[PDB]
Design a protein around this ligand. Structure first.
Ligand SMILES: [Ca+2]
Ligand SMILES: [Ca+2]
Ligand SMILES: [Ca+2]
Ligand SMILES: [Ca+2]
Ligand SMILES: [Ca+2]
Ligand SMILES: [Ca+2]
Ligand SMILES: [Ca+2]
Ligand SMILES: [Ca+2]
Lengths: 156, 159
């Protein structure tokens, strides 16, 4: 609803370099490299195949929109997870320690024994602390506080 | 907004409102902000409240808070789109878009002479970040802004 629609049409036309109303793998490749990516040919087929519901090998306007929705939803979620990670990981060393987890939980009350336990639940590789991979994987199937930390920190 | 959005907004307000009196004070906005590693002065805390303090009671009620979040989100989304679009253009990383950067990129995408000149307020011959910001916030000129916006947006979605 609205002129979201002019935005969508602008977005599509930036990909549809020839104006014919479809985006090919080529077209996609060319915009992607201007964005500072270097996608392989296989990467490009697959972004086409996920949204190619009519099977024709290219992306039209409702397919592109679905591609946008899926990609918007997963950038946003993954950006907020990564902001919440950065919030806990205050020394920037790539791992959430128990003292870091505690400090953050507090400032927003867990005993040391409690926070060791939160870690153990998420600590797939056994090293006593929570890396990015593990944080990601905890955030998946409260949490909800963490999720709002990540959104908020973003927006701030 | 679906119930998931509201619940999240509600979470968020209850991160700030560390007690629960339904109001958000300067003391409380400060605590939470420092928990995300920022260091705002009292004067920045007070401005944040005053910008959305519709009934002038120097504190933030739940709808004021929504209002603060909606503006900061749109302002963050905006700033990040513009920055990314800067980054797509400033290919050599040096903090200025030259005419040739700008031409290379447009020709590449199939969307210069002198879009540069109109943007280059300090007269140094190319487009610094502030000037890119100014031009993107200040039909034909406008079609160009709109094309560039879609570039910042797309950028953001694919990084
Ligand atoms: Ca095309
Ligand atoms: Ca198709
Ligand atoms: Ca750490
Ligand atoms: Ca671990
Ligand atoms: Ca309160
Ligand atoms: Ca108020
Ligand atoms: Ca440059
Ligand atoms: Ca200049």
């Amino acid at each position: 609803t609205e002129e979201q629609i002019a935005e969508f049409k602008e977005a599509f036309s930036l990909f549809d370099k020839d104006g014919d109303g479809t985006i090919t793998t080529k077209e996609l490749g060319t915009v992607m490299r201007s964005l500072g990516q270097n996608p392989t040919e296989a990467e490009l087929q697959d972004m086409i195949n996920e949204v190619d519901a009519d099977g024709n090998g290219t992306i039209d306007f409702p397919e592109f929109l679905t591609m946008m929705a899926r990609k918007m939803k997963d950038t946003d979620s993954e950006e907020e997870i990564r902001e919440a990670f950065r919030v806990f990981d205050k020394d920037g060393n790539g791992y959430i320690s128990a003292a870091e987890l505690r400090h953050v939980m507090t400032n927003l009350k867990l005993t040391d024994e409690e926070v060791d336990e939160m870690i153990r639940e998420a600590d797939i590789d056994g090293d006593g602390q929570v890396n990015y991979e593990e944080f990601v994987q905890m955030m998946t199937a409260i949490r909800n506080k963490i999720r709002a930390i990540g959104k908020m920190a973003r927006v701030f």
